[PDB]
Amino acid sequence: GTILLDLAPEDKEYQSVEEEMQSTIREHRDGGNAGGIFNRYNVIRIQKVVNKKLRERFCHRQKEVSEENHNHHNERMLFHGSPFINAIIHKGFDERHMFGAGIYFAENSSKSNQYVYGIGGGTGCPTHKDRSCYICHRQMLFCRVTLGKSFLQFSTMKMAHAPPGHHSVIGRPSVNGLAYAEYVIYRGEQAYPEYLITYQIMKPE
Ligand SMILES: [Zn+2]
Numbered sequence: 701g702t703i704l705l706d707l708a709p710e711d712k713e714y715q716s717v718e719e720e721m722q723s724t725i726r727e728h729r730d731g732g733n734a735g736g737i738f739n740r741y742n743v744i745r746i747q748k749v750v751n752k753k754l755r756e757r758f759c760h761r762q763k764e765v766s767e768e769n770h771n772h773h774n775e776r777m778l779f780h781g782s783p784f785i786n787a788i789i790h791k792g793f794d795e796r797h798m799f800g801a802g803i804y805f806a807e808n809s810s811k812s813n814q815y816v817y818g819i820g821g822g823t824g825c826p827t828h829k830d831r832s833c834y835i836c837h838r839q840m841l842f843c844r845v846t847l848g849k850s851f852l853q854f855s856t857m858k859m860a861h862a863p864p865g866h867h868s869v870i871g872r873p874s875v876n877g878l879a880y881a882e883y884v885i886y887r888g889e890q891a892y893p894e895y896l897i898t899y900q901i902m903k904p905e
Pocket of ligand 1: 825826827828829830833834835836
């Protein structure tokens, strides 16, 4: 099944992942209700997710998307937060579980952090029922996402699948619209859970 390889903090690969995670934190419109109040994360560990079958499924779909998009799969590295992280690293993303019934990714780690415990932070951490828990270790993924031909929009366009000839939907920010970008796929084989990040949000002074 799945192997989790720990990255060393002194390794450039670990530093690249942590840097992308910390530098993409932003202030949210809810003032921190969903994901908590913090300026920085405390990274516990970063693991690379290895699974032969998941990799086959992802590479097979990447080839189809490339053929349908002028020989360009159009991959982006993006964050994902959800209460299904354990099922994802063993079974892969599954669409069966704003732009409708898709799988959502963000370029801002703090946006994904808002979904780690569910919609609007759900009921918070399982132990303390705290959306802003500074104690419990959280996890998010930093994924390879096959976007192919993306359908860009500034406002809600609810769909069950990407529009004809397209492979993903992108919600772009605008004043009066979305605060931050979101990337949506409608097939789980269009994302690979490359990195598993275990962390805490830090309580500011
Ligand atoms: Zn907790």
